[PDB]
Design a protein around this ligand. Structure first.
Ligand SMILES: Cc1ncc(COP(=O)(O)O)c(C=O)c1O
Ligand SMILES: Cc1ncc(COP(=O)(O)O)c(C=O)c1O
Lengths: 382, 364
């Protein structure tokens, strides 16, 4: 057929302005011996034999034609035991499964927001959190990253609202000042929403997360997480210390108008949970390696804001980012490009995601290859 | 928690749970038995528990875009985590804040939300009403016409050939959501566009893969270059994790089974017609022309009584109420699948006959 001008032109303009000939996030194919640091599989559970075996197992013997929205399966007898188990693991009263972390955030915010509702959101909070509030026509008030003072001032000005943060930030790998945020939430009669996508499983007792580690669990209204990180699965979940998960399934558009996880998917998650709560060994190893890399990189003078297994190289503009990218990939390092719309146009990041399979030798190489880039150079860092 | 949330939640529980006789949301009925008649699943060719498909999935989990594009006749196919995501991402890619989107009143909520997320200018046209559409485009300019090939609640069929002509006449792009026709309709299940010989004049087609394909995913088909751009523009495509590679393998087997399921299609097509005719002659309005039959039950209170009646007598039954429908135009949807029996069909007709009427409630 023939696309209307009002589309062809958008396509043409985009291709010319965004597409080395490929989109910035696409570099060169990597070799087996290269060090790949792109997966959110922090405990390297992707290929765990017990998980795969249990998925395969339940996947046999279905009824189980439950192709319909989860809203129709909110009777007790239809709700997966993995919800109760995730709730107990985490310390929250209730858990609700979602089709993704994105959906968990959009759905939860739709359930708890009115168009008038004040939403105080960290400037670096995940896009799903920005979008959920926007979809709800909430009044978003962003505060400077991890800046509690600014937050305080904002709430002073606009009144009670929902405070929304990532526990660990997906781009920069920094950690929210969660204890202070709980105090502020109490000081002003707000509700707190913490996205633990990058801390659930890697942090806390048995990996119960950062809120459990700091003993804040009972003090927080809501917690969300993609289960597609440490849990290594395409789903999400909403935890509530209240009765909000009773309503979400009937209010959230993604919960209502998109199909639910199949029963066998939940069964896998149960086994994943068990493996995760026993994985003290990989947690420790991952914590230690990330610190080594952090320290390694902070010497050298690089801006390394991280306090976690996520490390962001701040590489300025797209041109300069391409250059860094090519340089790291030319050596053994990959390497995930964060650019618009995820970042501001000239504040791009090449994220290094560590996992518990990375070893001492590999860190060293990464530091060395970064030391070379600084400043065998050819490009800059912010 | 804080009043501004507590107040909202209390009101909601009061006006959506407490008012029903079981104290539950309206969609929540009684527990089915074997062998009550269950008509809720969207798995139209009853593939959910197919031996081969399960085998292929497990196999690949231990240890397709091209095929789907060829299957359907479109130039390109791009996979998505859901039909919802497919629609939302497609709309986000081709829309600008300015764009006219001409959308059938009953088109799936994902298309509505997709246009809205993109800040498009939505122009609702009355269900399957081409005159209304003609007027709106004359008034507002070129834009994207968006329809369900088969509508999710009513089971009506879009007037596709006439929409193709309208789009050509008025310089519009056309988006067809084939979620409820892909696999059940057309040559080897290629769908309604294919059945009608219209594939080559539609710009875009989308589909949940969670109906006939019995899988949690979606796809976007393009007769142009858009699928090259969707992956770097759509928020669901950017900020939400992808399908794992073994998931795609399952779809390949599924596709093969669907391609060969001429038998199941035919039986389903026949059962649906038998039901449509049986229910119509009772004087219920039955707009459907497919395996989706909408019992029109008016208001929530009446709907509750209708569904309690049906379930009490072995028929289930998916309630569609706000926000899926108007407050006063609820539907109890019967979704047929290829496993459904003649005897079961007669049984449904019988139960609705007694229903129309034991008194107690009405149908529209
Ligand atoms: C017409 C239509 N499009 C899209 C969807 C959503 O598809 P999915 O459940 O894969 O998100 C549905 C919902 O059932 C639908 O009926
Ligand atoms: C903090 C945070 N929340 C939510 C998400 C979305 O998770 P999902 O891919 O399961 O939709 C992500 C990124 O994927 C994230 O980094």
């Amino acid at each position: 057929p023939q696309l209307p001008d009002f589309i062809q032109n958008k396509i043409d303009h985009y291709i010319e302005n965004y597409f080395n000939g490929k989109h910035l996030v696409l570099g060169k194919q990597a070799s087996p011996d290269d060090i790949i640091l792109q997966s959110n599989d922090y405990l390297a559970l992707a290929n765990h034999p017990l998980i795969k075996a249990r998925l395969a197992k339940s996947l046999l013997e279905e009824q189980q034609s439950l192709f319909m929205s989860a809203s129709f399966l909110q009777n007790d007898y239809d709700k997966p035991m993995i919800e109760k188990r995730l709730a107990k693991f985490t310390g929250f009263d209730e858990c609700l499964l979602s089709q993704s972390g994105w959906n968990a955030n959009v759905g939860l915010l739709q359930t708890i927001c009115q168009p008038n509702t004040n939403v105080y959101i960290d400037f670096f909070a995940h896009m799903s959190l920005w979008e959920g509030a926007r979809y709800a026509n909430a009044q978003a008030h962003p505060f400077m990253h991890n800046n509690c003072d600014h937050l305080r001032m904002l709430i002073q000005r606009h009144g009670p609202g929902i405070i929304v943060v990532d526990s660990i930030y997906s781009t920069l790998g920094t950690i929210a000042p969660l204890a202070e945020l709980v105090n502020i939430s109490k000081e002003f009669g707000c509700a707190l929403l913490v996205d633990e996508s990058h801390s659930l499983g890697t942090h806390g007792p048995n990996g119960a997360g950062l809120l459990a580690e700091l003993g804040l669990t009972r003090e927080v209204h809501f917690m969300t997480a993609s289960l597609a990180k440490t849990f290594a699965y395409r789903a999400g979940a909403i935890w509530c210390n209240n009765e909000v998960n009773r309503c979400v399934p009937f209010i959230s558009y993604p919960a209502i108008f998109s199909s639910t996880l199949l029963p066998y998917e939940a069964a896998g998650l149960e086994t994943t949970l068990e493996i995760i709560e026993s994985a003290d060994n990989r947690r420790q190893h991952l914590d230690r390696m990330a610190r080594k890399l952090r320290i390694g990189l902070s010497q050298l003078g690089l801006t390394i804001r991280s306090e976690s297994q996520i490390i962001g190289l701040e590489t300025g503009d797209e041109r300069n980012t391409e250059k860094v990218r090519d340089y790291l990939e030319s050596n053994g390092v990959f390497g995930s490009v964060f650019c618009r719309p995820a970042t501001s146009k000239n504040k791009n990041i090449i994220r290094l995601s560590l996992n518990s399979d990375v070893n001492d030798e590999q860190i060293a190489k990464i530091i060395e290859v970064c030391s070379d880039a600084v400043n065998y150079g050819d490009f800059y860092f912010r």
